[PDB]
Design a protein around this ligand. Structure first.
Ligand SMILES: *[C@@H]1O[C@H](CO)[C@@H](O)[C@H](O)[C@H]1NC(C)=O
Ligand SMILES: *[C@@H]1O[C@H](CO)[C@@H](O)[C@H](O)[C@H]1NC(C)=O
Lengths: 104, 254
C-alpha cells in the first residue's frame, strides 16, 4: 500500500496517485493493484487523464516496449530493427552483436 | 557494495526508496546500472556523479528532483539510458545534458515542464526514444526537435498543445512512432506532417479535430491512425490515397 489513494487489504491498491501507473499483479488466485513509477518488463506505460495503466507489449519477441508495437529491446536471438524483432538483419543491414541490434 | 544500496554481480545497483537526500557514495565506479528511484534527492550539486564513469543506465524516477547543476552530470560519456520522470523540473535541463553524446533513451514524462529552451538537445546524436508525457507544453518545440536527426519514437501525450505548424517535424526523417493523445489539438496545417517518410504509427486519440487532416497524405508507411474520440464529422472521398498500407483505424466514438 504505497503511493495509493485508496488501499484495501483484500484488493490491494485501487486508485494510484495522479502521476503513477496502476498495474494488476497476478499471483495464484490473488490479484491486486499496485502503483509504480514505471511499468515493468513486457509492458508499456499508457498515460491517461483519469488513471494511467500498463498494458502488455503486444509485439512478439519483445521484453521492453515503448508503445503497443515499438520494442526498445527484443529477446536474445533477434536483432532490433526500427523497434521490431528479426532473427536476421535484412537487406541493407548487417548484424552487430556488441549491442545486439541491426546496423547499416 | 555500500549500504543501503543492494548490488549484484552485474554491476547493477539498486537504492530505491532509501530516503537518501543526496547521491550515495562508496560505490564502485564499475557500476553500470544505478537506480535511486522513489528517493528524496531534492537537488543535484555540481559534478555529483564524478565517481561513476562506467555508468550505462541511470534512473531517478520520482525523486522530487528540482534543480540540476549545469555540470552535475559532466563526463557521463558512457550513458545510454537516463530517466527523470515524475519530478519537479520546470524547464528542460539543456546545460546538464549537453555532453551526453552516447545517450540513447531519455525519459522526461510526468514532470512539470512548461517550456523548452531552443538550445536544448544539442549534440544528442544517439537519441532514439524520447518521452515528453504529462507536461504543460503549449506548442511543439520545433527548433529543439530539429536537432534530433536519429529519433525513432517521440510522445507528447497529455500536454496542452493546440496546433502544429507546417514542417514542425521536418527534420525527423527517421521517426517511426509518434504519440499525441489526450492533447488539445484542433487544427493541423496542410504540410505539418511533411518529412515523416518513415512514420508508421500516428496516434491522435482525444482531440478536437473538426476536419479531416489532409496533412496525413504525406505518410507513405502509415499503418495505424487512431483519432477516435474527436469531433470529426466528414471523411472526404479519397482521403487515404497517401496511406496504401493502413492496417487499422480507430474512429469510433466520433
Ligand atoms: C527531503 O529532504 C529535504 C531537504 O533536506 C527535507 O526538507 C525533506 O523533509 C525531505 N523529505 C523526506 C520525505 O524525507
Ligand atoms: C534540418 O534542420 C535544419 C535547421 O532548420 C534545416 O536547415 C535542414 O534543412 C533540416 N533538414 C531536413 C529538413 O532534412
Amino acid at each position: 500500500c504505497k503511493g495509493c489513494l485508496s488501499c484495501s487489504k483484500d484488493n490491494g491498491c485501487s486508485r494510484c496517485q495522479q502521476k503513477l501507473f496502476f498495474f494488476l499483479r497476478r499471483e495464484g488466485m490473488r490479484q491486486y493493484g499496485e502503483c509504480l513509477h514505471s511499468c515493468p518488463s513486457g509492458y508499456y506505460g499508457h498515460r491517461a487523464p483519469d488513471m494511467n495503466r500498463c498494458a502488455r507489449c503486444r509485439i512478439e519477441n519483445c521484453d521492453s516496449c515503448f508503445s503497443k508495437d515499438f520494442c526498445t529491446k527484443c529477446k536474445v536471438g533477434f536483432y532490433l530493427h526500427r523497434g521490431r524483432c528479426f532473427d536476421e538483419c535484412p537487406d541493407g543491414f548487417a548484424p552487430l552483436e556488441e549491442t545486439m541490434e541491426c546496423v547499416e | 557494495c555500500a549500504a543501503p544500496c543492494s548490488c549484484d554481480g552485474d554491476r547493477r545497483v539498486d537504492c530505491s526508496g532509501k530516503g537518501l537526500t543526496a547521491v550515495p557514495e562508496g560505490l564502485s565506479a564499475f557500476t553500470q546500472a544505478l537506480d535511486i528511484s522513489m528517493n528524496n534527492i531534492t537537488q543535484l550539486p555540481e559534478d555529483a556523479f564524478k565517481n561513476f564513469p562506467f555508468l550505462e543506465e541511470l534512473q531517478l524516477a520520482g525523486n522530487d528532483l528540482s534543480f540540476i547543476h549545469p555540470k552535475a552530470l559532466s563526463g557521463l560519456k558512457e550513458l545510454k539510458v537516463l530517466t527523470l520522470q515524475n519530478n519537479q523540473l520546470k524547464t528542460v535541463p539543456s546545460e546538464a545534458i549537453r555532453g551526453l553524446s552516447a545517450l540513447q533513451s531519455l525519459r522526461l514524462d510526468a514532470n512539470h515542464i512548461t517550456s523548452v529552451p531552443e538550445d536544448s538537445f544539442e549534440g544528442l546524436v544517439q537519441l532514439r526514444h524520447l518521452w515528453l508525457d504529462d507536461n504543460s507544453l503549449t506548442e511543439v518545440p520545433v527548433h529543439p526537435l530539429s536537432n534530433l536527426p536519429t529519433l525513432q519514437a517521440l510522445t507528447l501525450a497529455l500536454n496542452k498543445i493546440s496546433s502544429i505548424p507546417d514542417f514542425a517535424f521536418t527534420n525527423l526523417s527517421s521517426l517511426v512512432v509518434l504519440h499525441l493523445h489526450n492533447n488539445k489539438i484542433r487544427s493541423l496545417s496542410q504540410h505539418c506532417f511533411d518529412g515523416l517518410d518513415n512514420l508508421e504509427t500516428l496516434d491522435l486519440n482525444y482531440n478536437n479535430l473538426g476536419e479531416f487532416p489532409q496533412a496525413i497524405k504525406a505518410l507513405p508507411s502509415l499503418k495505424e491512425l487512431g483519432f477516435h474520440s474527436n469531433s470529426i464529422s466528414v471523411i472526404p472521398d479519397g482521403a487515404f490515397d497517401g496511406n496504401p498500407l493502413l492496417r487499422t483505424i480507430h474512429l469510433y466514438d466520433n
